[PDB]
Amino acid sequence: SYDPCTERYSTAYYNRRDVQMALHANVTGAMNYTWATCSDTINTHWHDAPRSMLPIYRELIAAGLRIWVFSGDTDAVVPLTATRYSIGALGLPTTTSWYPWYDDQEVGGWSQVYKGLTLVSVRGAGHEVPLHRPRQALVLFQYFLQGKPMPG
Amino acid sequence: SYDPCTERYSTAYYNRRDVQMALHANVTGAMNYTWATCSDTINTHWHDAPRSMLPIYRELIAAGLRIWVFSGDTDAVVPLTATRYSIGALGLPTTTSWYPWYDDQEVGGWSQVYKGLTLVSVRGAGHEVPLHRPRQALVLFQYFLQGKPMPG
Amino acid sequence: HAADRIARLPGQPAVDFDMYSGYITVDEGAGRSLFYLLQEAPEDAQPAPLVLWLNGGPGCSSVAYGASEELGAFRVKPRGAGLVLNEYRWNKVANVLFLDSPAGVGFSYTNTSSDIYTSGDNRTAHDSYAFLAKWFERFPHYKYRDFYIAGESYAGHYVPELSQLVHRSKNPVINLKGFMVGNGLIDDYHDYVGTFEFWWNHGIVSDDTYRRLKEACLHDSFIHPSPACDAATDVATAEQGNIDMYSLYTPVCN
Amino acid sequence: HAADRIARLPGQPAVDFDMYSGYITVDEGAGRSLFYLLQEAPEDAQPAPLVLWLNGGPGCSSVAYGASEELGAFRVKPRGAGLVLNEYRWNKVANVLFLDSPAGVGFSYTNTSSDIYTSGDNRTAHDSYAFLAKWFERFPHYKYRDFYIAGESYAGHYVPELSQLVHRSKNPVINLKGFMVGNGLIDDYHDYVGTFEFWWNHGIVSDDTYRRLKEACLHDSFIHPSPACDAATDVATAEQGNIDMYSLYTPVCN
């Protein structure tokens, strides 16, 4: 099932002395606030941040590092198209054109393998892929760990 | 619930003598084939068909006829974007910009009211809107029948 | 018309509205007869409008889709073993008339085998009009009722075309108030464009295919594409894989 | 490290893998300590890789998301009353390390109140690196283990940046094998573009707004937009209404 309110539970659960204690957290009682899922202040007071990450990609790619980028295709915050264009700009060559990857009987999403980087989309998943398409998310994880392209 | 196999039931059901009989169909037994959901032949032997329907739209619009176009936004066969561009080309003026329409607590889709034509999208519906989003489909129907814009 | 009345369909549950079906010859010469099905609104809603609903294809039956797995009053059980009532049926508010068209579709038929290889918009439109005119003669209490036309997909052609006939015709027993089209063809060129764009924007085709589609198909018609366009198309299709093109995020049938 | 070990969390079910959590000071001067949580793989899967997972925001906790409602091992019951096991947890195959960062996020903290108003990519990266290096000293059996970095969204910045440090650094106890980013920032300009396009292609903004977005935001940064861009943005937002921007076709929470 899906429950869109999970953030609310987490908030409740991690704010219990019980729990913090079991985590070895907020040892002293010296964390002068309530535990929140995100830090507002931090979020509104951000400083440095480059406009592009491509140069780094280039460098790591050149380093032989394994690179995989993925996307939940029903996300509107950092949508699939943004990524397509972004990866597109690296200008890498294609080794394996856009093809559908399967999990079980269903199509899990699509994938394109470039020379030095693999791109994968997750059919039907929102921003938080492991929340919306758990099973698919895991397959992705195993493949990535293996350095093997998504299956057809 | 949803069942993607419905065409299969229909096929079974309408091919019973029982049923045809109750419909006053295939009176003689003179319909020399099996009942199919679509006619293949017809489909492959189509002749005349203009490239545009816009001129007709113009005419009817000019006639004061009530015109509503809609779209299931998860359809890939005659996708929402095709329609947007098409309506776009009529060049009508806007009376009510793209706005979200509600049904219950949820957003049912979007709508834009032009001068002479209303456009509506159905959130999450496939090609066959009343199959995928029945309840939303009905609201649409009632509004249309009333000549009233979708609600906010 | 009393004769087209349905007592009860096999497997049907009990309902509070009447239904009727039968044929109507639209070309006495050729022997063309179109089948219809009308599901009315319950009495206390009467007198409601009349709505003619059309499916597309071209070649697809309005009974099979519209009436049996969309807005009609019942849904077919599995293995076609009965019916179940659709709570969202449009006949909760209107008199809905489902038409199998053209001739050769669904239960509609022709006595001139050639007809099925020679269909087209035009003839389809003239036949529908004819059908109506007679239909009203068979259901005279519907004369002057507010009337609307509607359908999906290829009916993007049908509706407006037919609406245009009706309108030009000036028959007074027919109070056409408007129409409505869903996911329908409208303009080949624009639709081609929007189509590809949306595909690329839904992760369904590679960047190359997309570009190729734009190059192959832009001067074509939706219904009679060039070989180039088809080729582009065969690829896309392969890139999409086994999903349901009519509903991207729902499952394919097994 | 034996000291960071979790016996059991309140409401937790019984499991077959170890978990550990605690702090690690990354700036002795400023008094910056980052909290972590590590969920290992069951023994028979050992020795598996190590994976550092990062959430974004910037400002969002990796414990809250990653570990508690995404790929971590448990899911929180309603009213935060317990846990339930996630069958799809990534720690079924890898040792997963969740990091709250930066300082001021989640359970991570700072003794220098100013820190929270002065965060940035750079410092965030240097702190993460530090954290690691020490972390390995606390978990020496992890030295040389295959290691990967990963995260979402704003972590599109984090991952590669940090990956770059690690790489330049040349610490040998760290076998960085690669990384992976999901739905993440990559290039402001392109992302802006793809972003709007997809929106328009998902029926979420009018044609005008779309055009306006392209005009307002194209020279901006994703994280520090101009006033023009913001204005365009306020409109779009209104056109989208009450849906979940992170998952278009699922329901909003009540």
Ligand SMILES: *[C@@H]1O[C@H](CO)[C@@H](O[C@@H]2O[C@H](CO)[C@@H](O)[C@H](O)[C@H]2NC(C)=O)[C@H](O[C@@H]2O[C@H](C)[C@@H](O)[C@@H](O)[C@@H]2O)[C@H]1NC(C)=O
């Ligand atoms: C198309 O083909 C059918 C096979 O010929 C016709 O049915 C026959 O019609 C004859 C003429 O009026 C007649 O001698 C029989 O009624 C009949 N036989 C059977 C069993 O079908 C159809 O002719 C039409 O079918 C109806 C039964 C009725 O309307 C006829 O009177 C009618 O002409 C042909 N259908 C058409 C022309 O629409």
Ligand SMILES: *[C@@H]1O[C@H](CO)[C@@H](O[C@@H]2O[C@H](CO)[C@@H](O)[C@H](O)[C@H]2NC(C)=O)[C@H](O[C@@H]2O[C@H](C)[C@@H](O)[C@@H](O)[C@@H]2O)[C@H]1NC(C)=O
């Ligand atoms: C940040 O602020 C806390 C409040 O000062 C510090 O906690 C105190 O640390 C002192 C110094 O070593 C000491 O006299 C007490 O242990 C302590 N009091 C309490 C209840 O927190 C933190 O100092 C750190 O906190 C740990 C307990 C331990 O690592 C200390 O030894 C350590 O310096 C400050 N946290 C930092 C600097 O990371």
Ligand SMILES: *[C@@H]1O[C@H](CO)[C@@H](O[C@@H]2O[C@H](CO)[C@@H](O)[C@H](O)[C@@H]2NC(C)=O)[C@H](O)[C@H]1NC(C)=O
């Ligand atoms: C750290 O421990 C605290 C103890 O349970 C708690 O900080 C708390 O904040 C609340 C008020 O602002 C208060 O209800 C509670 O008693 C408390 N301690 C006080 C009186 O100073 C937090 O939940 C926790 N901080 C976190 C989660 O970072």
Ligand SMILES: *[C@@H]1O[C@H](CO)[C@@H](O[C@@H]2O[C@H](CO)[C@@H](O)[C@H](O)[C@@H]2NC(C)=O)[C@H](O)[C@H]1NC(C)=O
């Ligand atoms: C019209 O009635 C027919 C009777 O049940 C049937 O046409 C049938 O087609 C089948 C073979 O091609 C055969 O199994 C059956 O007996 C039959 N009639 C014959 C022997 O000529 C159809 O189902 C029906 N046609 C439709 C649905 O248009």
Ligand SMILES: *[C@@H]1O[C@H](CO)[C@@H](O)[C@H](O)[C@@H]1NC(C)=O
């Ligand atoms: C439209 O349709 C009627 C009915 O068959 C015919 O007179 C012609 O098809 C007409 N127009 C054409 C085809 O030019």
Ligand SMILES: *[C@@H]1O[C@H](CO)[C@@H](O)[C@H](O)[C@@H]1NC(C)=O
């Ligand atoms: C990156 O980060 C370290 C750690 O605080 C500092 O030496 C500077 O922030 C550095 N680069 C800069 C900011 O120029």
Ligand SMILES: NC(=[NH2+])NCCC[C@H](N)C(=O)O
């Ligand atoms: N899933 C399908 N194969 N649907 C076919 C239905 C299309 C048809 N032309 C209509 O009018 O709706």
Ligand SMILES: NC(=[NH2+])NCCC[C@H](N)C(=O)O
């Ligand atoms: N539905 C939400 N509000 N999600 C917020 C999560 C975004 C966060 N920055 C991440 O790393 O995932």
